[PDB]
Amino acid sequence: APDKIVLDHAFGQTILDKKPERVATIAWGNHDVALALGIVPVGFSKANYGVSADKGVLPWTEEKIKELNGKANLFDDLDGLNFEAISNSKPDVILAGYSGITKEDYDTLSKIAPVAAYKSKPWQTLWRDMIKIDSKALGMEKEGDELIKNTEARISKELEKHPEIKGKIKGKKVLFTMINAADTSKFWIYTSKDPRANYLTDLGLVFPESLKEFESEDSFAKEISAEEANKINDADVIITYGDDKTLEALQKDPLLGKINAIKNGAVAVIPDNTPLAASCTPTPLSINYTIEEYLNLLGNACKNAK
Numbered sequence: 001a002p003d004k005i006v007l008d009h010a011f012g013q014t015i016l017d018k019k020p021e022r023v024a025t026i027a028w029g030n031h032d033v034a035l036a037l038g039i040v041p042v043g044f045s046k047a048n049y050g051v052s053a054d055k056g057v058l059p060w061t062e063e064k065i066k067e068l069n070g071k072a073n074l075f076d077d078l079d080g081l082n083f084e085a086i087s088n089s090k091p092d093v094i095l096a097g098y099s100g101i102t103k104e105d106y107d108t109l110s111k112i113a114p115v116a117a118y119k120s121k122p123w124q125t126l127w128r129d130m131i132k133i134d135s136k137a138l139g140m141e142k143e144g145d146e147l148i149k150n151t152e153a154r155i156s157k158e159l160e161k162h163p164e165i166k167g168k169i170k171g172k173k174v175l176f177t178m179i180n181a182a183d184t185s186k187f188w189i190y191t192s193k194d195p196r197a198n199y200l201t202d203l204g205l206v207f208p209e210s211l212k213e214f215e216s217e218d219s220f221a222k223e224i225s226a227e228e229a230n231k232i233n234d235a236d237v238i239i240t241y242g243d244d245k246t247l248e249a250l251q252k253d254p255l256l257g258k259i260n261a262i263k264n265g266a267v268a269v270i271p272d273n274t275p276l277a278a279s280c281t282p283t284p285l286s287i288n289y290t291i292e293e294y295l296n297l298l299g300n301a302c303k304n305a306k
């Protein structure tokens with residue numbers, strides 16, 4: 001101020017004339033940026049992964065809302081953007097820095113309020129950039145930077161607190177994947193532009209050279225054939241969502257069982273549909289809530305590497 005706020009994103013530019021008071025957010029995580037900055041959204045998207053849709057809000061989010069003496073104002077939008085609900089919240093801005101909105105979505109949303117969209121591609125926003133984009137739209141760029149620094153300090157503290165884990169995982173080559181043990185003919189590898197993959201580097205892990213082959217500006221994950229399985233023998237550890245049958249199934253799999261990380265038992269299985277699984281695409285609030293338990297799980301997997 002007196003400068004307007006000018007946001008550049010995938011769909012052009014958004015201009016705000018002053019700092020927005022009523023904040024709506026959509027899609028994953030963005031509400032946690034507002035909340036970590038001390039603001040209770042006038043509405044935000046419902047969740048049903050790691051929480052029942054009946055509650056509709058993840059535990060770290062609910063806890064911050066209660067600290068701020070607010071309440072959860074949820075858009076009934078599990079089946080897609082609910083434009084009427086958003087419009088009824090009377091927002092001054094819509095935060096969508098990590099999201100999958102289309103141009104049609106963007107145009108419809110912009111009729112309601114200024115929209116902070118992602119920079120280039122849907123679902124390709126790392127956690128620090130989600131904070132940068134979302135906090136700029138709030139006119140709180142400096143506070144967003146302070147939040148990033150504080151979140152980085154939390155990560156560092158948790159690592160220093162458990163030196164054996166930090167030492168075990170440091171420099172280990174990792175891939176975050178989605179593998180369905182019931183059909184291993186194809187599986188997914190999350191790319192370096194996906195926040196759940198890059199978060200692993202914040203913890204001291206690194207990507208293997210094999211990831212570069214699968215990289216593509218066009219998406220946040222690549223579908224890999226079992227025929228290509230051998231390419232990822234350079235991973236020391238693999239992460240996948242799964243359950244209590246996943247590791248055993250993969251080790252007995254006649255297509256993937258020979259892959260080094262799998263053969264060695266160096267597989268971090270993130271229990272499906274839990275708050276921990278939800279937290280793997282991190283937000284400032286989820287990190288503090290889950291980092292000890294995530295590092296413990298990753299550390300235990302890395303013990304089996306080699």
Ligand SMILES: [Cl-]
Pocket residue numbers: 027028045
């Ligand atoms: Cl979402």
Ligand SMILES: [Cl-]
Pocket residue numbers: 035036037038039
């Ligand atoms: Cl606060």
